Amino acid sequence: ISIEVEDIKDAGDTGKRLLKINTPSGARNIIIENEDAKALINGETTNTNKKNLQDLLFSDGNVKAFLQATTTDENKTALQQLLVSNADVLGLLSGNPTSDNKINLRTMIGAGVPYSLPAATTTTLGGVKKGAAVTASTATDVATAVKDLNSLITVLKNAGIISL
Amino acid sequence: ISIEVEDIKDAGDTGKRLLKINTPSGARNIIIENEDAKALINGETTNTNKKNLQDLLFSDGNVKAFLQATTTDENKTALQQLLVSNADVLGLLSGNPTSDNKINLRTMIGAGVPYSLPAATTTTLGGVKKGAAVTASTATDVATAVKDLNSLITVLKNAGIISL
Amino acid sequence: ISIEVEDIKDAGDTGKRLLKINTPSGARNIIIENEDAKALINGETTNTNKKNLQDLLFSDGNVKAFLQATTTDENKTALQQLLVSNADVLGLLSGNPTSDNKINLRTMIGAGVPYSLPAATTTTLGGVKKGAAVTASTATDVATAVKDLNSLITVLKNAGIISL
């Protein structure tokens, strides 16, 4: 004979809807209630569907922000920590390393600090200024020879080559 | 009585296929047309299925390249920007920092530039060369004393300790 | 007339279960056997479901560790390589750059090494120590003038300003 779907007395509501349906798309529309999941199964997702599916797939919020390609400075700090273990390198990646990080980063690459040349002292190597010009001596008496020696001494004193 | 599936006159084509099906796998084969989605639901995905599902799940192409573990230099630039906000650090991560980035990176870690010791001038602290040997004086007349003074002067001039 | 589901003689086992089912949730429970996939479709995933879905979606183990927000040092090395192409920068990100990496990292940012001021030599610019104090000369004879010259010479010798 011929019966119809509604003649089947113990069929369920969804069961009768499925029996009447003609295509797979129609069946998916009955079976899948979550609109984001339905969109994935249909291979047709909006950016909103994608974000919502990412919420169903991943627990970590910093990972989720990365996957959305939109990260805050806090998300970036956490993501840096997933990528790099060295604390001083993490300081560098923040753009704001601590004093300790800075020292350790220089050590890490063998870099020095800005060097400033200190003046010579009696205990410590240093720079000097060059002494003023001094004429060779043509002295024929003691008085003049002493005058010329003293001119050299003052020049060396003036340039901080010898102490006062 | 006994009826068969095709006796149900208002059943749909997919509906009759489902009513005849014996297992859940058979039902999934009817209902899910997208082969990548079907593969996910079956828990059996090839690398191609995985790439195609990633295309359905994520909009950002640089994120997608990261998830495929294959990034171009352009993808890497964009991913760096998702991970780090400091412009000078981004310059470092590129391997090709600008002049401004280089200055700022040194500031950031308190590093100096390569130092070259300049010669002393009359205005500016600097290095000198060490003067040649000079004998102590045993002069008993003015002529010799002057000779010995002049020997010291020339030595200091030769080493650039005093000006010509 | 009235028939029941079990009167349909060529219905399949899953087909009869679906025909009896009343709701979409009930239909999903019949059709989807993989518990992680069912959880995604129901929009209700535990952390275990999420990890298991990530296993179905991504092939690369280092990417998977990143997505779980739990990376080993080995995972971090591999993820760094997906993010940065410059070998010397990768050395920095490891926290343990090689000697070659260190040289190249300094070059990259225009940094110098720690500078140590060398003593002056007869060939090479260097620092000096400042000479001890020397009194101006009040000599009225050759013997004293020579004494004063020699005092200057010794002071300059003592400070390594001139050679012995």
Write structural notes for this entry.
Chains A, B, C: Homotrimer. Forms a super helix coiled coil in the homotrimer. 3 copies of one chain form a homotrimer. With 164 residues, the first copy, chain A, is mainly α. Chain A folds into 2 domains: 1-113, no CATH class; 114-164, Helix non-globular (Helix Hairpins). Chain A has helices spanning 13-20, 24-31, 35-41, 47-57, 61-67, 73-83, 87-93, 99-109, 142-158. In chain A, helix 3 (35-41) packs across helix 4 and helix 5 crosses helix 6 (73-83). Chains in contact: A-B, A-C, B-C. At the A-B interface, helix 1, helix 2, helix 4, helix 6 and helix 8 of A face helix 1, helix 3 and helix 9 of B.
Structure summarized in a few sentences:
Three copies of one chain form a homotrimer. Chain A is an all-alpha fold and 164 residues long. Chain A has helices at residues 13-20, 24-31, 35-41, 47-57, 61-67, 73-83, 87-93, 99-109, 142-158.
